[PDB]
Nucleic acid binder design. Structure first.
Length: 108
RNA sequence: GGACUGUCCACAAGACAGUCC
């Protein structure tokens, strides 16, 4: 399966500068393992909250999605979506070009 | 790069202004 790409990286919307890494492993872990845990901010603490979690398999991301997907657990609902790159590259997917030994990003 | 403070906006991978090291 590749119909949304395969990074196993999953977006939780809420956090509300209210809940934390605790909820992250909670919500996401409800139906998977979890190999990485991320909450998104600014200045390393100008300070907001939005969550990213990486799962040992993309299966498990889908699982925690299918489970969660509009449940409610910090005095608010959580939104659960499969995560996508923070900037444009091609459309709906990264789809990188072919390469092997092109010139390194350095010189005189 | 780190710590702070003021602001938009705070649920896609954030940033602005001012300060100190």
């Amino acid at each position: 399966m590749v119909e949304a790409d395969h990074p196993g990286k999953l977006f939780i919307g809420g956090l509300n500068r209210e809940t934390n890494e605790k909820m992250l492993k909670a919500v996401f872990g409800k139906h998977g393992p979890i190999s990485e845990v991320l909450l998104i901010k600014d200045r390393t603490s100008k300070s907001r909250g939005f969550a990213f979690i990486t799962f040992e398999n993309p299966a498990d991301a889908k699982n925690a999605a299918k489970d969660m997907n509009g449940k409610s657990l910090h005095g608010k609902a959580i939104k659960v979506e499969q995560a996508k790159k923070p900037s444009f590259q091609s459309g709906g997917r990264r789809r990188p070009p072919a390469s092997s030994r092109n010139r390194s990003p350095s010189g005189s």
